Design a protein around this motif. Structure first.
Motif, short mmCIF file in Angstrom:
data_model
loop_
_atom_site.label_atom_id
_atom_site.label_comp_id
_atom_site.label_asym_id
_atom_site.label_seq_id
_atom_site.Cartn_x
_atom_site.Cartn_y
_atom_site.Cartn_z
N UNK A 1 -3.88 4.67 13.75
CA UNK A 1 -5.46 4.50 15.06
C UNK A 1 -6.28 5.20 14.29
N UNK A 2 -5.97 6.15 14.04
CA UNK A 2 -7.18 7.70 13.22
C UNK A 2 -7.30 7.44 12.17
N UNK A 3 -7.24 6.46 11.56
CA UNK A 3 -7.79 5.30 10.15
C UNK A 3 -8.07 4.11 9.99
N UNK A 4 -9.70 3.68 10.51
CA UNK A 4 -9.92 2.10 11.88
C UNK A 4 -9.09 1.46 11.73
N UNK A 5 -8.17 1.89 12.77
CA UNK A 5 -6.40 1.62 13.20
C UNK A 5 -6.41 0.34 12.27
N UNK A 6 -5.59 0.78 10.78
CA UNK A 6 -5.32 -0.14 9.74
C UNK A 6 -4.16 -0.36 9.37
N UNK A 7 -2.84 -0.78 9.24
CA UNK A 7 -1.46 -0.47 8.35
C UNK A 7 -1.63 -0.33 7.40
N UNK A 8 -3.02 -0.89 6.30
CA UNK A 8 -2.83 -0.46 4.91
C UNK A 8 -4.06 -0.48 4.28
N UNK A 9 -4.38 0.79 3.85
CA UNK A 9 -5.45 0.87 3.48
C UNK A 9 -6.00 1.49 2.34
N UNK A 10 -6.76 0.89 1.20
CA UNK A 10 -6.51 0.85 -0.34
C UNK A 10 -7.71 2.37 -0.30
N UNK A 11 -7.02 3.01 -0.96
CA UNK A 11 -7.70 4.80 -1.74
C UNK A 11 -7.90 4.75 -3.36
N UNK A 12 -9.31 4.89 -3.48
CA UNK A 12 -9.62 4.74 -4.93
C UNK A 12 -10.31 6.78 -5.23
N UNK A 13 -9.40 7.22 -5.57
CA UNK A 13 -9.90 8.76 -6.32
C UNK A 13 -10.01 8.52 -7.31
N UNK A 14 -11.55 9.73 -7.34
CA UNK A 14 -12.68 9.92 -8.57
C UNK A 14 -11.59 10.14 -9.77
N UNK A 15 -12.16 10.30 -11.14
CA UNK A 15 -11.27 10.72 -12.44
C UNK A 15 -11.77 12.52 -12.74
N UNK A 16 -11.14 12.84 -13.46
CA UNK A 16 -11.95 14.50 -12.95
C UNK A 16 -10.42 15.09 -14.67
N UNK A 17 -10.31 15.99 -15.14
CA UNK A 17 -9.82 16.72 -15.79
C UNK A 17 -8.43 17.54 -15.62
#
Length: 114
Positions: A24-40
């Motif tokens: 619920x604390x996250x758009x009330x969803x079971x699965x959430x697709x995350x895409x972290x940026x790229x760094x050193x």
């Protein structure tokens, strides 16, 4: 300074899933697709929180997590393995990694009426 260095890591993707109540604390969803940026430096749990606490987390953090670390109730699991054995904050997420976040604290239950 032009043409200095070249080699900026690419953005990694991770599948985050929250048990019952937390979703619920996250758009009330079971699965959430995350895409972290790229760094050193590779995205480590420590930082991951900052993101999942802002990007994903849409509600107040103090409720879900408190600080750069997960509350004393929110149990996380990396690839079906307690992040404790792997690396609470020492672990460094690479990619195609699935992070689980369960909440076993907010269980308002005491004086029953019906």
């Amino acid at each position: 300074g032009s043409s200095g260095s070249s080699g900026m890591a690419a953005p990694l993707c991770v599948k985050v899933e929250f048990g019952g109540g937390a979703e619920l604390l996250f758009d009330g969803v079971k699965k959430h697709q995350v895409a972290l940026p790229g760094q050193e430096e590779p995205w480590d749990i420590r930082n991951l929180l900052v993101w999942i606490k802002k990007n994903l987390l849409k509600e107040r953090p103090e409720l879900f997590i408190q600080g750069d670390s997960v509350r004393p109730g929110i149990l996380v699991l990396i690839n079906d393995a307690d992040w404790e054995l792997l690396g609470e904050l020492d672990y460094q997420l690479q990619d195609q990694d699935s992070i689980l976040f369960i909440s076993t604290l907010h269980g308002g239950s005491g004086p029953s009426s019906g």
